[PDB]
Design an enzyme around this catalytic site. Structure first.
Site, PDB file in Angstrom:
ATOM      1  N   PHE A  60       6.492  -4.017  -3.158  1.00 21.51           N
ATOM      2  CA  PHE A  60       6.204  -2.708  -3.474  1.00 21.51           C
ATOM      3  C   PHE A  60       7.758  -1.990  -3.377  1.00 21.51           C
ATOM      4  O   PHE A  60       8.243  -2.051  -4.667  1.00 21.51           O
ATOM      5  CB  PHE A  60       5.339  -1.858  -2.669  1.00 21.51           C
ATOM      6  CG  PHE A  60       5.055  -0.300  -3.158  1.00 21.51           C
ATOM      7  CD1 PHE A  60       5.437   0.129  -4.321  1.00 21.51           C
ATOM      8  CD2 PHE A  60       4.636   0.494  -2.210  1.00 21.51           C
ATOM      9  CE1 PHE A  60       5.362   1.481  -4.612  1.00 21.51           C
ATOM     10  CE2 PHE A  60       4.284   1.889  -2.806  1.00 21.51           C
ATOM     11  CZ  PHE A  60       4.726   2.152  -3.903  1.00 21.51           C
ATOM     12  N   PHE A 113      13.808   5.718  -3.278  1.00 22.08           N
ATOM     13  CA  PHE A 113      13.183   4.051  -3.031  1.00 22.08           C
ATOM     14  C   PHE A 113      14.010   3.144  -3.822  1.00 22.08           C
ATOM     15  O   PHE A 113      14.447   3.486  -5.029  1.00 22.08           O
ATOM     16  CB  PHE A 113      11.895   4.032  -3.129  1.00 22.08           C
ATOM     17  CG  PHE A 113      11.127   4.686  -4.334  1.00 22.08           C
ATOM     18  CD1 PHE A 113      11.126   5.895  -4.585  1.00 22.08           C
ATOM     19  CD2 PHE A 113      10.602   3.576  -5.305  1.00 22.08           C
ATOM     20  CE1 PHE A 113      10.352   6.230  -5.769  1.00 22.08           C
ATOM     21  CE2 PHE A 113      10.196   4.092  -6.455  1.00 22.08           C
ATOM     22  CZ  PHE A 113      10.122   5.355  -6.628  1.00 22.08           C
ATOM     23  N   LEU A 122       4.294   4.977 -11.307  1.00 24.46           N
ATOM     24  CA  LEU A 122       5.226   5.917 -10.944  1.00 24.46           C
ATOM     25  C   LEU A 122       6.059   6.478 -12.164  1.00 24.46           C
ATOM     26  O   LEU A 122       6.658   7.510 -12.007  1.00 24.46           O
ATOM     27  CB  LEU A 122       6.231   5.527  -9.929  1.00 24.46           C
ATOM     28  CG  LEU A 122       5.552   4.964  -8.961  1.00 24.46           C
ATOM     29  CD1 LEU A 122       6.485   4.438  -7.613  1.00 24.46           C
ATOM     30  CD2 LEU A 122       4.674   5.927  -7.979  1.00 24.46           C
TER      31      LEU A 122
END
Ligand SMILES: CCCN(Cc1ccc(N)cc1)C(=O)NCC(=O)OCC
Length: 165
Positions: A60, A113, A122
């Site tokens: 992820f 991130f 996202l």
């Protein structure tokens, strides 16, 4: 003209691991790129040096940048506690994408991130502003200290950071 480059020197329980460098897309998201650049040099008197990657989920992403609360609840930008979503021109296309963490619309601070997979859901919600340039191997090494719930098995820190020529 030229997009800036910044580096992080990563450590694992205090032991040096390696360097990750990033291209920041100042050509497309100058405000967001400038925040990350300045937090990386520490030139405003606060920033990323010494902070940790508090949430790492293999397959992820790796999340860091909380230098005020050290756990994913804090951080602040160079423009104040929060700033707006600049634009969503760039998408979460795959591993190495650098994007802003947030807590709702227009709540960017310092947390960010690094994707280790494509995270298309996202898109349009998190502002993408850079990519790993060198050291994706180091990001993959960091990733192995994560877990399904994100808690890391060793402390993953930014031992040093700054801007490259
Ligand atoms: C309610 C949780 C919001 N936070 C923590 C956060 C807090 C403050 C700022 N400025 C950014 C993120 C989050 O970490 N949200 C999820 C996120 O961003 O994930 C990106 C893959």
């Amino acid at each position: 003209m030229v997009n800036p480059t910044v580096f992080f020197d990563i450590a694992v329980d205090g032991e040096p691991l390696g360097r990750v460098s990033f291209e920041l897309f100042a050509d497309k998201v100058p405000k967001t790129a400038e925040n990350f650049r300045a937090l990386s040099t520490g030139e405003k008197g606060f920033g990323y040096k010494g902070s940790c990657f508090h949430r790492i989920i293999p397959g992820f992403m790796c999340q860091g940048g909380d230098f005020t609360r050290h756990n994913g609840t804090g951080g602040k930008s160079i423009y104040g506690e929060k700033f707006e979503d600049e634009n969503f021109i760039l998408k979460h296309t795959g591993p190495g994408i650098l994007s802003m963490a947030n807590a709702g619309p227009n709540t960017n601070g310092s947390q960010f991130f690094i994707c280790t997979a494509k995270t298309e859901w996202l898109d349009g919600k998190h502002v993408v502003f850079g990519k790993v340039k060198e050291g994706m191997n180091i990001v993959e090494a960091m990733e192995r200290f994560g877990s399904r719930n994100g808690k890391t098995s060793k402390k993953i820190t930014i031992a040093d950071c700054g801007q490259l020529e």
